[PDB]
């Protein structure tokens, strides 16, 4: 609804991804274990479907605002590539597991939700802001579109 909220949501996607990088990198191949990492996974979407519903619900950002969401927007790219090279890291488990579909539709998920996300966020940047949004936003698709063809 303000962009106070929306910096909040947006460093809760923040927590959300480092918290499924842990996962990751303990991943053994055990079924216990995905199904601990799918929860937060789950959560991760909800929270990005949050970061846009509200997003959407707020008005053109100022100056300083629009800099700060473009900021933890992008701050956020980092921790996508180091979590998709840790699912993508842990392949011969999640094949040993046999869950590999499960990867492969969160990512498909989780790339159209940041997908939303971003777009809603280039709405209500300034004209600036929203290209090295759309442009960080490249590199984010770019992770995923890499991740996911590994995965099938
Ligand atoms: C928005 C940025 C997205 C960053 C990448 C986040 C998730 C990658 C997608 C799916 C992987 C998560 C859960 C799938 C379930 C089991 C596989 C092993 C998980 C584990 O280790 O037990």
């Given at each position: 609804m303000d962009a106070a909220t929306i910096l909040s949501d947006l460093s809760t996607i923040k927590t959300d991804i480092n918290t499924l990088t842990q996962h990751f990198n303990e991943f053994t191949g055990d079924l216990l274990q995905a199904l601990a990492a799918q929860a937060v996974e789950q959560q991760l979407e909800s929270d990005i479907d949050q970061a846009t519903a509200d997003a959407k619900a707020?008005?053109?950002?100022?100056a300083a605002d629009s800099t700060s969401v473009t900021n933890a927007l992008l701050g956020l790219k980092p921790d996508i590539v180091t979590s998709l090279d840790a699912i993508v890291a842990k392949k011969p488990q999640v094949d040993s597991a046999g869950v590999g579909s499960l990867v492969l539709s969160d990512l498909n998920a989780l790339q159209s939700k940041t997908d939303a996300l971003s777009g809603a966020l280039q709405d209500i940047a300034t004209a600036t802001d929203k290209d090295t949004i759309a442009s960080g936003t490249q590199d984010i698709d770019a992770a995923f579109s890499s991740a996911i063809a590994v995965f099938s």
């Open positions: 707020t008005s053109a950002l100022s």
